[PDB]
């Protein structure tokens, strides 16, 4: 439709001093090696460069020259609008700027006034002290990171081929990852939570809220400093070790990348960086719209230095931190000119195309990219040789709403099985999907988790092991396990789980904020319930670990769609097959079934590999897992063979073929 992607690539490849040709990787590597600030370890010189076309003069200031506005003026802009400076070593032979001290760049504007900014490619920035804040407000401060010894990676990236391998994703947030009302750290995650995720068996960790942001209750979505990992949890070397460690564990690490919008903050953010309304962002008079959920600003992808900035940002996280891939947030607001309330923004789309090219050129056959897109735009996840966007996956954001309607309005006798199957299997061919049954927003104040819809206030008295389950608690535990498993096996090409729902976390989540007196009482995760043996929460957690490890041995996610054979409206039973394996579910409120027939297409002997009625999962142990299920050579539910099962009221099972 438009050929902006190809025009922009020719200019990249002949942007050399002699006119000779270079590669796209060479462009983005030479950029993060040439822009920002860089120390020379052999001569002790330092070089700094900075794009700022609206500014007339530029001066580097900070603790290293006592914020002097005259002594370190940069050389005149070249024909591309870039200031530059070489700092000689001091007379004693030392670097002229000390390590982790505070710095700013000052610009003189056309009207002669002065503004103060954190440099745009800085690698660290920090929240102010209570004394500074009473005076100057809540603005963050930027730091010059030049340590005496940089962390040296010891492990290679894990062996991974995107086309062939499955990926199961644990969605996590560093700060809430403890039972205490506080902000937890990178090192605590490395030592206390990486083992829990390895026990549960996920392939990858999706890190939310890593790009730096000042407003905590925004869950990470309002970004201020793009080349800086967040300081409220620790330092750049702490994170490199966290990733080196996951890599030794065989775990890929992905970054939540927010390139859809930016914070409205001015001094600690990019809004009005060089004084003007039109450097990184579209001007307000351009009428190019606003984000419908977040008070924010939007980028101008057509500027050559903005392409250099965002593309170097991707190569920097891959090369310098050894991240393995990305989830792009807010894709629905980027794709459309009305930002989600059918007319497409082709400049924003061309940037995502070039971004997918670079990332796959950097790690041939291994790199991963994912999209957050409510709308479901077609061709987003097809390759570039076929005209596509180049994404590998998208999220399945409609599924959680099906379960809420069921519990609020219907008696148990009146559940509709055919409606449940249709919702889970409706996806577009060639465009792979990440599925889940409740989202990180459903866990918040004012909302209700799955667990609360099922059992209500009786969770605060009758979740004890000491008394036999009441009628309400028995019903509730069984349904919580059945809902996750049918989502995992029937609903997509990858899986996702939000921290805490793997065990039925009660009550709600709430960050510190004005309406609760900045209370951290609900800004935490009661991992301690999993560790208490007088309660039933551990029953749900042990079920989750068994689900994930089953998939890694018997692949079923990154494979073709399932064939479904049953969905009965008076008995309330569902059954299907995928990548050669078999799945069965019974939802009836009072009746248990003996000798129920189930269909199967490849003859042989089958054995159960997962079962929800285990006592260790809170069940009543009515089901015998040592049984061999031989196939009968007779057609059933449109398959070539069948087996016969016993399934009590409210239980589910999975089976595979013995070679």
From Swiss-Prot:
UniProt pathway annotation: Glycan biosynthesis; glycogen biosynthesis
Active-site residues, Swiss-Prot/TrEMBL: 329, 372
Enzyme class at the top of the EC tree: transferase
pH behavior: Optimum pH is 7.
EC number in record: 2.4.1.18
Binding site for (1,4-alpha-D-glucosyl)n: 67, 104
Main localization, broad class: cytoplasm
Keyword set includes Protein biosynthesis: no
Superkingdom classification of source: Eukaryota
GO biological process: glycogen biosynthetic process
Site (Transition state stabilizer): 441
Keywords: Cytoplasm, Glycogen biosynthesis, Glycosyltransferase, Transferase
Pfam family, one: Alpha-amylase_C
UniProt cross-references to SUPFAM superfamilies, sorted A to Z: (Trans)glycosidases, E set domains, Glycosyl hydrolase domain
Protein family: Belongs to the glycosyl hydrolase 13 family. GlgB subfamily.
Function text: Glycogen-branching enzyme participates in the glycogen biosynthetic process along with glycogenin and glycogen synthase. Generates alpha-1,6-glucosidic branches from alpha-1,4-linked glucose chains, to increase solubility of the glycogen polymer.
SUBUNIT field: Monomer.
Protein name stated in the entry: 1,4-alpha-glucan-branching enzyme
Organism: Candida glabrata (strain ATCC 2001 / BCRC 20586 / JCM 3761 / NBRC 0622 / NRRL Y-65 / CBS 138)
Lineage: Eukaryota, Fungi, Dikarya, Ascomycota, Saccharomycotina
């Amino acid at each position: 439709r438009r050929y902006l992607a190809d025009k922009w690539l020719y200019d990249i490849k002949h942007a050399t001093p002699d006119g000779s040709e270079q590669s796209l990787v060479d462009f983005a590597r030479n950029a993060y090696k040439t822009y920002g600030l860089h120390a020379n370890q052999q001569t002790k010189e330092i070089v700094y460069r900075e794009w700022a076309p609206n500014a007339q003069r530029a001066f580097l200031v900070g603790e290293f020259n006592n914020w002097n506005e005259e002594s370190h003026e940069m050389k005149h802009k070249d024909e591309f609008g870039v200031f530059s400076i070489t700092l000689a070593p001091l007379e004693n032979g030392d670097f002229a700027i000390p390590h982790d001290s505070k710095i700013k760049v000052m610009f003189v504007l056309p009207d002669g006034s002065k503004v103060y900014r954190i440099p745009a490619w800085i690698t660290r920035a920090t929240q102010p002290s209570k004394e500074t804040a009473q005076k100057y407000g809540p603005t963050y401060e930027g730091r010059f990171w030049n340590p005496p010894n940089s962390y040296q990676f010891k492990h290679q990236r894990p062996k991974f081929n995107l086309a062939n391998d499955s990926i199961k994703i644990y969605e996590a947030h560093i700060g809430i990852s403890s039972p205490e009302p506080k902000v937890a750290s990178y090192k605590e995650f490395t030592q206390n939570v990486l083992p829990r995720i390895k026990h549960l068996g996920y392939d990858a960790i999706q890190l939310m809220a890593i790009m730096e942001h000042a407003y905590y209750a925004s869950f990470g979505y309002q970004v201020t400093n793009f080349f800086a990992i967040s300081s409220r949890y620790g330092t750049p070397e702490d994170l490199k070790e966290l990733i080196d460690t996951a890599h030794s564990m065989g775990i890929l690490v992905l970054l939540d990348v927010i390139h859809s919008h930016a914070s409205k903050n001015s001094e600690d953010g990019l809004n009005m960086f060089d004084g003007s309304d039109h450097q990184y962002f579209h001007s307000l008079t351009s009428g190019r719209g606003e984000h419908p959920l977040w008070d924010s600003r939007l980028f101008n992808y057509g500027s050559f230095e903005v392409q250099r900035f965002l593309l170097a940002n991707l190569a920097y996280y891959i090369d310098v931190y050894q991240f393995d891939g990305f989830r792009f947030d807010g894709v629905t607001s980027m794709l459309y000119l009305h930002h989600g309330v059918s007319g497409v923004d082709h400049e924003a789309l061309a940037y995502l195309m070039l971004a997918n090219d670079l990332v796959h050129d950097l790690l041939p056959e291994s790199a991963v990219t994912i999209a957050e897109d409510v709308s479901g735009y077609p061709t987003l996840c097809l390759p570039r040789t076929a005209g596509g966007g180049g994404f590998d996956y998208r999220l399945a954001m409609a599924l959680p709403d099906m379960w809420i309607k069921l519990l609020k309005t219907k008696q148990d006798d009146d559940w509709d099985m055919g409606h449940i199957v249709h919702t889970l299997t409706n996806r577009r061919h060639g465009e792979k999907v990440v599925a889940y049954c409740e989202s990180h927003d459903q866990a918040l104040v004012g909302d209700k988790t799955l667990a609360f819809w099922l059992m209500d206030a009786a969770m605060y008295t009758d979740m004890t092991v000491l008394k036999e389950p009441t009628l309400v608690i028995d019903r509730g535990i069984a349904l919580h396990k059945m809902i996750r498993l049918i989502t995992h096996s029937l609903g997509g090409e990858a899986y996702l789980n939000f921290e805490g729902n793997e065990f039925g976390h009660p009550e709600w989540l709430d960050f510190p904020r004005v309406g609760n007196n900045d209370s951290y009482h609900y800004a935490r995760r009661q991992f301690n319930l999993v560790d208490d043996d007088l309660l039933r929460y551990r029953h749900l957690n042990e079920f989750d670990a068994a689900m994930q490890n089953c998939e890694s041995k018997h692949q079923w996610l990154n494979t073709p769609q399932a064939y479904v054979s049953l969905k009965h409206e008076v008995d309330k039973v569902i059954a299907f097959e995928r990548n050669g394996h078999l799945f069965v579910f019974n939802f009836h409120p009072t009746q248990s079934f003996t000798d129920y027939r189930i269909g199967v297409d490849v003859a042989g002997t089958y054995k159960i590999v997962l079962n929800t009625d285990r006592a260790e999962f809170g069940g009543h142990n009515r089901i015998d897992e040592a049984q061999e299920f031989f196939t009968t050579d007779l057609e059933w539910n449109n398959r070539r063979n069948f087996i016969q099962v016993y399934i009590p009221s409210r239980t589910a099972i999975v089976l595979t073929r013995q070679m």
